[PDB]
Amino acid sequence: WLIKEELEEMLVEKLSDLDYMQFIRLLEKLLTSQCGAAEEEFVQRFRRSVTLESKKQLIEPVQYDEQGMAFSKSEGKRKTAKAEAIVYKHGSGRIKVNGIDYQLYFPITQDREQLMFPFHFVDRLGKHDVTCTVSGGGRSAQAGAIRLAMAKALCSFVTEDEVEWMRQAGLLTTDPRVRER
Amino acid sequence: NQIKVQEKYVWNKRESTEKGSPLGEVVEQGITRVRNATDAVGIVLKELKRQSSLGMFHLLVAVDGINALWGRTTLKREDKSPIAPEELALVHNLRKMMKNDWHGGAIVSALSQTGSLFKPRKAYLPQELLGKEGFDALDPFIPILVSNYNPKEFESCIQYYLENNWLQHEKAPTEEGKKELLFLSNANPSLLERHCAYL
Numbered sequence: 466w467l468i469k470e471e472l473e474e475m476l477v478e479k480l481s482d483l484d485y486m487q488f489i490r491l492l493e494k495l496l497t498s499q500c501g502a503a504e505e506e507f508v509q510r511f512r513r514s515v516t517l518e519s520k521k522q523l524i525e526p527v528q529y530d531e532q533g534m535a536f537s538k539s540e541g542k543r544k545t546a547k548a549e550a551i552v553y554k555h556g557s558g559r560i561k562v563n564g565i566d567y568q569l570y571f572p573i574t575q576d577r578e579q580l581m582f583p584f585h586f587v588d589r590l591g592k593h594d595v596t597c598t599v600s601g602g603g604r605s606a607q608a609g610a611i612r613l614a615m616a617k618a619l620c621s622f623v624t625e626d627e628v629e630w631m632r633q634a635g636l637l638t639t640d641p642r643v644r645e646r
Numbered sequence: 647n648q649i650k651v652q653e654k655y656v657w658n659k660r661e662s663t664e665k666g667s668p669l670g671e672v673v674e675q676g677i678t679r680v681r682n683a684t685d686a687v688g689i690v691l692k693e694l695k696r697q698s699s700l701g702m703f704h705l706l707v708a709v710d711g712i713n714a715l716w717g718r719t720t721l722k723r724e725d726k727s728p729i730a731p732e733e734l735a736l737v738h739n740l741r742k743m744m745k746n747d748w749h750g751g752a753i754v755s756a757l758s759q760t761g762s763l764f765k766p767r768k769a770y771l772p773q774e775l776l777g778k779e780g781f782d783a784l785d786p787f788i789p790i791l792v793s794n795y796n797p798k799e800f801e802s803c804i805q806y807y808l809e810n811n812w813l814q815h816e817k818a819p820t821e822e823g824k825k826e827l828l829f830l831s832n833a834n835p836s837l838l839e840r841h842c843a844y845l
């Protein structure tokens with residue numbers, strides 16, 4: 466419903482709160498009855514709009530390499546660590562971190578679990594190849610940045626429902642928690 | 647007892663092993679008096695490399711972590727100065743066994759970065775671990791690669807662990823648990839075993 470101040474601006478007259486309540490009650494009563502097209506337009510003169518926060522999720526385009534393989538690229542950030550990931554449409558679950566296999570680049574099991582989380586959530590383990598380059602930060606910041614970048618790249622090969630589920634799981638959101646002065 | 651020495655070895659002015667004595671005596675002299683332990687190892691090697699050539703028996707030289715012989719040590723003198731690997735009688739007598747100046751056997755060895763001195767964690771190829779000196783010493787040699795489990799080996803290892811009831815988590819037998827194990831270990835036998843240890 467139009468707010469009180471917007472009704473003020475459109476009417477070019479100041480009105481109290483109770484009379485705005487009364488007008489909104491009349492509008493709701495009109496809505497309840499079998500209002501026609503003219504009455505529907507008259508009501509729509511008084512109803513503003515709103516938006517969502519799922520269409521603002523950017524799905525990166527699918528590129529093609531020289532060999533004709535489809536892929537998708539993305540970026541992620543965590544503390545001072547910055548990651549740039551490429552996810553291939555087809556693969557065997559090979560992840561190369563700075564040209565090094567992930568189990569060698571990430572000795573700690575926690576980081577390997579962080580890298581596993583995006584594919585396990587959408588059940589695509591062993592179905593994609595990943596080539597990612599990370600720089601800066603520590604082991605955990607690098608793992609988080611890689612996870613974000615690789616989820617943002619994987620959004621291209623999944624359904625929109627799966628993209629929304631990944632968003633709601635907190636996978637496609639940059640973590641803004643950084644060291645304070 | 648079948649193998650018999652071919653020279654008189656003098657442990658001390660009082661004690662010596664006479665020619666023709668069984669090899670076990672020498673070993674016993676090394677097991678009883680540790681003062682002559684290191685001298686007793688070399689003699690054993692000196693016999694085995696020799697007699698195998700004569701054809702008495704076949705000898706297998708199996709050295710794990712062979713990359714240590716031509717590297718560096720963390721041992722010091724009393725002047726806090728470093729000691730080289732060739733200064734150690736135990737290491738100096740084992741290099742002679744790596745040379746292919748004998749026949750009647752085979753020499754098998756396996757590299758290992760675990761426990762190595764002055765090597766990065768990710769160095770695994772022959773030169774990176776051996777060094778120039780080590781590669782030259784072993785050259786010519788036949789290298790054999792050991793990789794991670796292929797899908798058949800990984801599935802068989804997990805079936806063995808399940809057959810021993812070693813995976814107690816209720817989800818581990820399921821296929822999703824196997825995919826998660828495969829990803830977290832990447833089919834590496836050691837990582838898979840360590841992760842299955844506490845499941």
Ligand SMILES: Nc1nc2c(ncn2[C@@H]2O[C@H](COP(=O)(O)OP(=O)(O)O)[C@@H](O)[C@H]2O)c(=O)[nH]1
Pocket residue numbers: 654655656657658682684685686687688689692735739
């Ligand atoms: N106690 C004792 N040890 C010996 C005797 N002879 C050889 N050895 C040991 O057995 C090993 C035989 O290796 P060898 O061919 O003689 O090497 P090298 O003489 O130092 O060049 C030596 O390293 C000695 O430590 C001996 O007559 N008495």
